[PDB]
Design a protein around this ligand. Structure first.
Ligand code: NA
Length: 129
């Protein structure tokens, strides 16, 4: 599924991400925009043999089990396929484990490059939340 901007914003809000670890809602929306273009089915194979899965492009070397990344960890305790669902629940629950402190969104490269220190409120402006 490809979410609309405001559609995702509302879902993220529902899921309790606003002000999670001090990060306003727009941060999460912006991350998703630049990581996956809001596509729940997005996957990207990395040169280390790991893969990034889903709307937040969560990686198999540490966070999920895809059965094909040798010597990796599974910190969210889920199969990576759970992260490709149309509903964002599994992805949000894993993202909450990833962001364990107030600097935790640095785990996402696209967030650091396109979101951090910008007007992230733009990503929810014009929506009904
Ligand atoms: Na893994």
């Amino acid at each position: 599924k490809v979410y609309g901007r405001c559609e995702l914003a509302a879902a993220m809000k529902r899921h309790g991400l606003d002000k999670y670890q001090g990060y306003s809602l727009g941060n999460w929306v912006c991350a998703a925009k630049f990581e996956s273009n809001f596509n729940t089915q997005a996957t990207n194979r990395n040169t280390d043999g790991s893969t990034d899965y889903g709307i937040l492009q969560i990686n198999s070397r540490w966070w999920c089990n895809d059965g094909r990344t040798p010597g990796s960890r599974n910190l969210c305790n889920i199969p990576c396929s759970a992260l490709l669902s149309s509903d964002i629940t599994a992805s949000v629950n894993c993202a909450k484990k990833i962001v364990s402190d107030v600097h935790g969104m640095n785990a996402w490269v696209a967030w650091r490059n396109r979101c951090k220190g910008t007007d992230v409120n733009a990503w929810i402006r014009g929506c009904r939340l």
